[PDB]
Amino acid sequence: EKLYSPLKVGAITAANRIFMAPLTRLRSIEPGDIPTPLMAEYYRQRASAGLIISEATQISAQAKGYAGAPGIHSPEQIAAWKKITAGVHAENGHMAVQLWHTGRISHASLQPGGQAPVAPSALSAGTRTSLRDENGQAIRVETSMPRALELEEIPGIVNDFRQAIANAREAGFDLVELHSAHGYLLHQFLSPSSNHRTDQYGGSVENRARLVLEVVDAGIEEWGADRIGIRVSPIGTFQNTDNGPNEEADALYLIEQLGKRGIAYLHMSEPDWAGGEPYTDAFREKVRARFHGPIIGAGAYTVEKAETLIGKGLIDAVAFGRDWIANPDLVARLQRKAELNPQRAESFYGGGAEGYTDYPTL
Numbered sequence: 001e002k003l004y005s006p007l008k009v010g011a012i013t014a015a016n017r018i019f020m021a022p023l024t025r026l027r028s029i030e031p032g033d034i035p036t037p038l039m040a041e042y043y044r045q046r047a048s049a050g051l052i053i054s055e056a057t058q059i060s061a062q063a064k065g066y067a068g069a070p071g072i073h074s075p076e077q078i079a080a081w082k083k084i085t086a087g088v089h090a091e092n093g094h095m096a097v098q099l100w101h102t103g104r105i106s107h108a109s110l111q112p113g114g115q116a117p118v119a120p121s122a123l124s125a126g127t128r129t130s131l132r133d134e135n136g137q138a139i140r141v142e143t144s145m146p147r148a149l150e151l152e153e154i155p156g157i158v159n160d161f162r163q164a165i166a167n168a169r170e171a172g173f174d175l176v177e178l179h180s181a182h183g184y185l186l187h188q189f190l191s192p193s194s195n196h197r198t199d200q201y202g203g204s205v206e207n208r209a210r211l212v213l214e215v216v217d218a219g220i221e222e223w224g225a226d227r228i229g230i231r232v233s234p235i236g237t238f239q240n241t242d243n244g245p246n247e248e249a250d251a252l253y254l255i256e257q258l259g260k261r262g263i264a265y266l267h268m269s270e271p272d273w274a275g276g277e278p279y280t281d282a283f284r285e286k287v288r289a290r291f292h293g294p295i296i297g298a299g300a301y302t303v304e305k306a307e308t309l310i311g312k313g314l315i316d317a318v319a320f321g322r323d324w325i326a327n328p329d330l331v332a333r334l335q336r337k338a339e340l341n342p343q344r345a346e347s348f349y350g351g352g353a354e355g356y357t358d359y360p361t362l
């Protein structure tokens with residue numbers, strides 16, 4: 001089938017089309033938010049994927065919203081990431097980094113100096129984040145009250161993204177994925193429910209899509225379009241945040257803007273039944289007419305759904321998450337039609353090797 005054929009995603013050529021979606025695991029070394037050698041073994045076992053989009057990596061210390069998430073702003077962090085990308089490349093694999101800014105989804109205890117997290121508006125998130133207790137295990141705590149970002153502070157955010165993209169090329173990554181999704185800073189400014197600003201960065205799709213389109217333009221200049229990809233969640237409710245009443249009209253604007261820049265790929269996170277309506281083939285046809293590059297689909301995907309959409313030319317690859325968590329040889333299991341290992345969800349956040357590198361291969 002086409003799920004096992006090469007695809008040109010940006011400047012690299014993926015071996016297959018069964019990608020590994022970004023999966024936050026909260027296994028970094030604290031203090032410092034430094035990747036660990038155990039994470040290198042984790043990504044090494046799953047190098048069979050055509051493209052490995054790493055866990056959400058903070059662009060700066062202000063972007064730390066989850067205790068245990070890795071960073072790519074410190075020299076000690078870039079050193080560990082260089083060792084991880086080396087192992088993935090040593091197994092004929094391709095790995096990409098997902099740069100994010102947690103924004104309002106954060107806790108003041110993790111922010112530098114105990115300050116309140118930043119956001120487009122001071123509206124709360126309503127969701128919960130993950131911290132660490134005395135024993136180091138993950139605990140669910142409510143998000144702190146965010147602070148409205150000042151217009152003079154927005155160029156500082158764009159610069160930290162460009163600096164993180166620069167460190168990503170230094171860390172040996174093949175591509176970069178920007179977390180414009182799941183109710184995070186770049187999303188917080190894209191959804192009317194999250195951005196009640198009155199400046200040039202709020203109040204209209206153009207004003208609510210400028211910041212993200214800027215970071216995309218910053219990456220295009222620092223590295224190149226072939227190396228910059230974006231994950232978007234334009235339709236549906238993800239992590240207690242919706243996309244306003246004109247989600248479909250505002251989606252086609254940002255997609256057409258990203259389609260005129262020639263970015264590497266477009267990773268669309270699809271909602272389940274609780275979030276919203278599934279992606280209609282009429283809506284997918286509108287997205288493909290504006291974005292002429294590789295489109296990566298994720299969200300309750302099966303091998304049947306992936307093959308059908310790839311044949312229709314609506315998507316070029318599929319990204320699995322929990323299946324890659326529990327099946328390190330997922331590409332082998334899906335081609336041989338074998339059984340998938342059970343997913344132990346209690347070990348998805350925090351802990352050690354249990355639930356991380358203990359899943360056996362075929």
Ligand SMILES: Cc1cc2nc3c(=O)[nH]c(=O)nc-3n(C[C@H](O)[C@H](O)[C@H](O)COP(=O)(O)O)c2cc1C
Binds near residue numbers: 025179298319321
């Ligand atoms: C433990 C866990 C952590 C996740 N962390 C991220 C993240 O950091 N950034 C992101 O874009 N998506 C994240 N996701 C969502 C996945 O990327 C993927 O879109 C989602 O799991 C789709 O479900 P699926 O496995 O059925 O395809 C996470 C999912 C899980 C289960």
